[model samples]
Target: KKRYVAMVIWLYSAFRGVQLTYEHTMLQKK
Candidate 1:
């Protein structure tokens, strides 16, 4: 159960990081 919780947290963090990175890239293009 602990491992599963850790994986969930990591996935959430990664998803947010990717979203921010994509937004930053789009701003750079303009």
Candidate 2:
């Protein structure tokens, strides 16, 4: 259960980073 929680947190962080990157690029284009 601990390992699963850690993995979920890591995945959430990675997804957040990707989303921020995408938003940054879009802002740069505009």
Candidate 3:
């Protein structure tokens, strides 16, 4: 149970990081 909480946090951070990078790439393309 304790470890699952940390896993969730890590996944969320990775998801957001990927999303931000994708947006930056589109901006540079324009």
Candidate 4:
């Protein structure tokens, strides 16, 4: 149970990081 919660947090952070990087790259392109 606790492991799943930790995994969820890890996944969320990794996803957010990628999303931010993608937006940053797009902004640079514009």
Candidate 5:
């Protein structure tokens, strides 16, 4: 379903942002 896909994409982006932010912080620390 389109709605389900949208939700998945939203969650994916949010998770991805969190991941990127975590990586960025780690890289900065190093």
Candidate 6:
């Protein structure tokens, strides 16, 4: 099982269809 960024990505998709809203608290990124 991927216990990293990719895993969390899929987890988001699983939980909320990956629908990222402006209010969504995302981690650091470029």
The C-alpha lDDT values of all candidates are: 0.70, 0.70, 0.69, 0.70, 0.71, 0.54
What does the lDDT read for residue 12 in candidate 3?
71
Q: Per-residue lDDT of 1-30 in model 1, one digit per residue for the tens? A: 578778789887877666756687774354
- Candidate of highest lDDT: 5
Candidate 5 has its poorest 10 consecutive residues by lDDT at: 21-30
* lDDT, model 4, position 7: 73
* lDDT per residue as tens, model 5, 1-30: 578888789887877666656688774355
What is the per-residue lDDT of model 2 for residues 1-30, given as tens digits with 9 covering 90 to 100?
A: 578788789887877666756677774354
lDDT for position 20 in model 6: 43
Candidate 4 residue 25 C-alpha distance from true site, Å: 3.2
Question: Between which residue pairs do clashes occur in model 1?
Answer: none
lDDT of 3 by residue, 1-30 (tens): 567778788887776666755677774354
Model 1, C-alpha of 4: deviation from truth (Å)? 4.4
Candidate 5 regions with alpha-carbon error over 4 angstroms: 1-3, 27-30
Flag regions of model 2 displaced more than 4 Å.
1-4, 27-30
TM-scores of all models? 0.33, 0.32, 0.33, 0.32, 0.33, 0.24
**Compared with the true structure, what per-residue lDDT tens digits does model 4 show for residues 1-30?**
578788789887877666755677774354
Separately for all candidates shown, the number of backbone clashes (residues 3 or more apart, or on different chains) is 0, 0, 0, 0, 0, 0
Q: Write the per-residue lDDT of candidate 6 for residues 1-30, one digit (tens) a residue.
A: 566877677766655533444336662121
Worst 10 residues of 2 by lDDT: 21-30
Candidate 3 residue pairs in backbone clash: none
Error of 3 at 4 (Å): 4.7
